[PDB]
Amino acid sequence: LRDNIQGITKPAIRRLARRGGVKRISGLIYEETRGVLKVFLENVIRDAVTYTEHAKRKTVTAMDVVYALKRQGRTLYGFG
Amino acid sequence: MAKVSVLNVAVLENPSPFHSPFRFEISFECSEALADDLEWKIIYVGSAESEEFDQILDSVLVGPVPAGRHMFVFQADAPNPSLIPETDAVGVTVVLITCTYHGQEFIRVGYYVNNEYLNPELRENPPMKPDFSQLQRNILASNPRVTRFHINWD
Amino acid sequence: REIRRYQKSTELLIRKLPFQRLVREIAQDFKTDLRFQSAAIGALQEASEAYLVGLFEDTNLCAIHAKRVTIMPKDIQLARRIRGER
Amino acid sequence: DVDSEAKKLLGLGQKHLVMGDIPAAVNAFQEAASLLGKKYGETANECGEAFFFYGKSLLELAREEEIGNLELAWDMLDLAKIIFKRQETKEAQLYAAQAHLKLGEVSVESENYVQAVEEFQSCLNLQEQYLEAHDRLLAETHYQLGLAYGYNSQYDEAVAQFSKSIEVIENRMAVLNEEIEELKELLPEIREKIEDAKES
């Protein structure tokens, strides 16, 4: 059950969907949405904590995080 | 930041049959003469459900690269119909272009790709196994997505 | 008219405390002795919402491109690739 | 008659957009858009131009009920944006580019920068798609895009957008050889933005 703990509710998920122009979702969206976020957080947590051990911090803060995300990738809608 | 800057890409003769080679017009700009090698790739996502069905269509390895504006045209053959899962065969998918400065991905441009039947009945009732010769590949020139990862440029 | 909404910028679409316990258990699969500053959490928070709104921008796109309105997981997986990290 | 009254209402509306009267412009567009959506339907593209200008005046009117104007301005610009994204002409696409421009500016005043840069990135994609190498609209958006970055503390990326903008000015300053005063005095605006951007 512990592996079933979630960090984002179903209300939030549809809120985030509609603000990206989404008009309707299938039932399995909630799991997929929750599935891929975990991955995101996995990939992110590791880096930020890595730099926490690299900066030899213990109360790791954002300053680690933002570096840990500049490491993740920036998607833009064109080339200019 | 980055020593290279892709200025623009251009998909040519779009759309076209499934079996025709891809043709992109690519153009970049090296802020400095580059010592190591640049590698450009075209990748066709065969199944959304697993990157396993990625199909690296072509790749060119260039090095050393001078500084300044460069443009070339990348042509790569059509993806292998025998390796595509037939679910994913007709529908929407993705194609990718990536460059690599001595072994690290620093940019990934991506396109949706809509493969449709145009024979009116085949879109109406499609055959169980996909007729790739009768499929048309419409890449989405309207909506590119460029994801740039920061790497070491030394 | 079922077209894109927008934010207010005042606060988040994600509660921090359900979020934080998830953070906790994900991080504890790695180690057992860790602690997290509330600033770090809020950082992960906004990052999460950001990535989510991005994929939904793409997810609706391909979903648009098949003649369809309701979105399917495959479209999510696809938008993840047109970004591309797996 | 509806088509006739609406087109002049769009005329008198932009003529309040020169006059300096913002609310009058806003209401000229309200009914104009009201007549079109009520005749052709909210989906019809004949609403687009009025939709754009409607969402345009509300943005100007937003200067503590600003977010409310932000709501409706965003919606109309989003309705017009998809009305244009449907039509495959040069004009409508560049109109969706302009729609994306205003959408992006609707986000920076909303301090929703992540979406702002996006809509400016989108407007640029369509302009680049269509316009020519020496067109002042490219500098109209590179500039805008740089500041939005600066507002997002992406100061290095901000400067680069500025440079692309100024260069757009300088290169059109070549065929203009074989508006030169007009370029000369809006170059100080950008250089000041450049010197200040990574200064932070």
Numbering used by the authors:
A (entry chain C): 22 to 101
B (entry chain D): 1 to 154
C (entry chain B): 49 to 134
D (entry chain H): 38 to 100, 170 to 284, 299 to 320
Passage from the reporting paper:
We successfully solved a 2.85 Å crystal structure of the covalent sNASPc-8G-ASF1b–H3–H4 heterotetramer, in which sNASPc indeed adopted a monomer conformation. Comparisons of the sNASPc monomer and dimer structures reveal that the central 4 turns (residues 285–298) of the long α89 helix in the dimer structure had transited into a disordered loop in the monomer structure. As a result, α89 separated into two helices, α8 and α9, in the monomer structure with α9 being folded back as a canonical capping helix. Interestingly, the structure of the H3–H4–ASF1b part within the sNASPc-8G-ASF1b–H3–H4 heterotetramer is highly similar to the reported structures of the ASF1–H3–H4 heterotrimer. The α3 helix of H3 is sequestered and bound by ASF1b, thus the H3 α3-binding groove on sNASPc is unoccupied, consistent with observations in a previous biochemical study. Moreover, sNASPc binds only to the αN region of H3 and, as expected, the interaction between sNASPc and ASF1b is bridged by the H3-H4 dimer. Notably, the αN region of H3 adopts an extended loop conformation, also observed when H3 is bound by factors that modify or bind K56 (49,50), but distinct from the α-helix it forms within the nucleosome structure. The extended αN region of H3 interacts with several conserved residues from the α4 and α6 helices and the loop connecting the α5 and α6 helices (Loop56) on the convex surface of sNASPc. The side chain of H3 Tyr54 penetrates into a pocket surrounded by Ile173, Leu176, Glu177 and Trp180 in NASPc α4 and Ser216 in sNASPc Loop56, with its aromatic ring establishing prominent stacking interactions with the side chain of sNASPc Trp180, and its hydroxyl group forming hydrogen bonds with the main chains of sNASPc Ile173 and Glu177. To test the role of conserved residues for the sNASPc-H3 interactions within the sNASPc–H3–H4–ASF1b and sNASPc–H3–H4–ASF1a heterotetramers, we used the GST-ASF1a–H3–H4 complex to pull down sNASPc wt and mutants. As compared to the binding of sNASPc wt, the sNASPc mutants E177A W180A D181A (EWD3A), L185A I188A, and E224A E225A disrupted interactions, while the sNASPc mutants W180A and N218A Q221A reduced binding to different extents (lanes 2–7 in Figure 3F).
NASP is a major histone chaperone for H3–H4 dimers critical for preventing histone degradation. NASP and its homologues share an atypical tetratricopeptide repeat (TPR) domain. They constitute the SHNi-TPR (Sim3-Hif1-NASP interrupted TPR) family, predicted to have four TPR motifs with the TPR2 motif being interrupted by a long acidic region, a capping helix region immediately following the TPR4 motif, and a disordered C-terminal region containing a nuclear localization signal (NLS). Here, we report the crystal structures of the sNASP dimer, the complex of sNASP with an H3 α3 peptide, and the sNASP–H3–H4–ASF1b co-chaperone complex.
